[PDB]
From a paper:
Mechanosensitive (MS) ion channels are a ubiquitous type of molecular force sensor sensing forces from the surrounding bilayer. Here we determine the structures of plant and mammalian OSCA/TMEM63 proteins, allowing us to identify essential elements for mechanotransduction and propose roles for putative bound lipids in OSCA/TMEM63 mechanosensation.
After standard protein preparation, cryo-EM sample preparation, image collection, and data processing, we solved the cryo-EM structure of hTMEM63A and mTMEM63B in a detergent environment at an overall resolution of 4.0 Å for mTMEM63B and 3.3 Å for hTMEM63A. Structural comparison of the monomeric hTMEM63A and AtOSCA1.1, demonstrates that the M10 of hTMEM63A is rotated into the ‘central cavity’ and would sterically hinder the dimeric interface, providing a likely reason for the monomeric form. Like AtOSCA1.113, the putative narrow pore of hTMEM63A is formed by the M3, M4, M5, M6, and M7 helices, which is a typical hourglass-like pore. The tightest point along the permeation pathway in the hTMEM63A pore occurs around the conserved hydrophobic residues F555, F556, and Y559 on M6, with the narrowest section of the pore being less than 2 Å. Interestingly, we found a lipid-like density that plugged the cytosolic entrance of the pore at the intersection of M4 and M6. The coordinating residues of hTMEM63A that interacted with the putative phosphate of the lipid were W473 on M4, E571 on M6, and W613 on M7, while hydrophobic residues on M0 and M4 interact with the acyl chain.
Numbering used by the authors: 9 to 86, 131 to 224, 232 to 295, 320 to 372, 382 to 718
The structure:
Amino acid sequence: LWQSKAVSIREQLGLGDRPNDSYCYNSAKNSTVLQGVTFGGIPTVLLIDVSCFLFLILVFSIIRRRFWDYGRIALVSEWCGEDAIHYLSFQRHIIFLLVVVSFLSLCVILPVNLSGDLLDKDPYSFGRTTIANLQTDNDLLWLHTIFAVIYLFLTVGFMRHHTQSIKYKEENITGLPRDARKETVESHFRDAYPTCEVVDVQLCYNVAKLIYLCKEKKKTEKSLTYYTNLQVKTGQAISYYTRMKDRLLERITEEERHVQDQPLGMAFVTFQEKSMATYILKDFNACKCQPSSHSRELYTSKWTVTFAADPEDICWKNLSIQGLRWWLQWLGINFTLFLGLFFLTTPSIILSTMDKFNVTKPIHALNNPIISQFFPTLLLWSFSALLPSIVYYSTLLESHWTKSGENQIMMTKVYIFLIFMVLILPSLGLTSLDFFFRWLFDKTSSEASIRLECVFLPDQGAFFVNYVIASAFIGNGMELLRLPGLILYTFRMIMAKTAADRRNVKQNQAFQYEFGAMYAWMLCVFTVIVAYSITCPIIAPFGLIYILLKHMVDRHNLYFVYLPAKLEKGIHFAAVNQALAAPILCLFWLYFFSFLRLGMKAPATLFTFLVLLLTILVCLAHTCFG
Ligand SMILES: CCCCCCCC/C=C\CCCCCCCC(=O)O[C@@H](COC(=O)CCCCCCCCCCCCCCC)COP(=O)([O-])OCC[N+](C)(C)C
């Protein structure tokens, strides 16, 4: 039924014989590898992954209070926030959004798709459940679009409930406008900034950052050369201890002199300028930027004057040189990151199709689902767990000026890059590979009938259902275990030597919850779910289990482990924006597929284009106008 008779039926079904049937793989030599691995893979992947959940959560119960304490590491030594009841509330509102999605979806769409004809002669073939709803003629293909709109309206709504709970605390009057003007001179800005009827306080023209580097280095070096002069019961190997005073020398000589040599050069460098025009005229000036004091308009501050940044934040270090140099750096960084995305996604996609190439081979040779549907999705989960961090490092090396801005950009970029990898790259690559497969299966010499009717995805959508299942199970497992972390803790304390240091380590492993990266992970998976939902119904049921198992793993993690944190209220709103993005990406994938298939000028695709266009437009309004 699932491993025995299973293959038998598929092996010998259709065999041409199309009095009227469309099947898809009708032109088959008995069978074709392009058919599909059993039920899609969902059976074997679920078992292998639910086993893994039940392994990882059985290697947590054992390690919680053992392994030093990487379980409760926060309930140990010196409730969880208000910026956590918000994250948990987002999670809850998404649980309910997806419960509704699941219900509606499953019911309506599973029936709609199952009433198909293509990919239907096969009994068990994830495909019958996906979009194998004929092409035209099936009027039901309109339903998909009308249900997609139900999903955007639903997510606008359920997210609004969430945003009617995250109380923007009447925050941002920061009378400190910035600038980006010409080098040289200062009091001329202490003339034009005055304009007329304006009460400035100060100016301060930004300079450089070599000093900043040395300082932090010297302070950390100081930490070393001071504290590590103890060792053999002295005071803040043995040969290293006898060279630690020379390393202390290094700090107090090289770096020290170096420090002072930077003030030597401070005045030399010149960049832009902040200004402390206080009161409320800030607005006036920021709005103007204009003419007023033309006497003092050599450089006309022909550069942006952009409110403030609040001294605490402004990464003085990264005031590169603005303009050209900064954006080129940005370009470089983002492009390397994109080529990396390509690399990872490629490996996983090709593992997944490394059987369905020669499309003339019998369905026998389709590779066990655990080398086409588990291993691929696990590698993608894995390489999509490095992305959170590589994106962080990238953000740093882009010289983002404002530090809060850097935090939010980190959130948005983890989102973009993750969404990308998973959803997008696989979708594009797989759909392209299927166009390819359907060329090579519908070669038939000059019959260029690459029936773009059955070109959905190589596995008919299973790659992503399996990514979601994988995620849910294995990932909630690994967020509960946080294996990489237990490993560090362990070793850090295996070489703790003294129990003083032990205490130190335990009193240190207690990261404040990063409600930035986590919002993003959750939302990348929510995006996969919603996007493929109306076009691969089964993903939602196996996705409510993701968010239900993440509300659960986070109500553990955000209490037992992970320290209380407080974030800019902006990070919660970026999440709401990203879920709205998920439903719009769903409408967009419905479009892409109704364009590959179903032509490009038929009612179906046109309806979905209309909605897509309108939605992108109203969204643009709320971005610009508001
Ligand atoms: C008590 C101690 C004993 C523990 C026993 C239990 C052992 C496990 C048993 C069961 C669960 C199985 C887990 C497998 C996934 C491993 C990932 C990993 O650990 O690293 C990390 C991710 O990933 C990486 O950083 C490296 C990834 C490289 C690829 C290797 C993947 C393995 C498959 C290769 C196939 C070869 C090619 C196949 C060719 C056909 C995990 O980190 P994280 O959880 O993502 O958390 C950080 C980020 N996050 C929180 C934001 C998400």
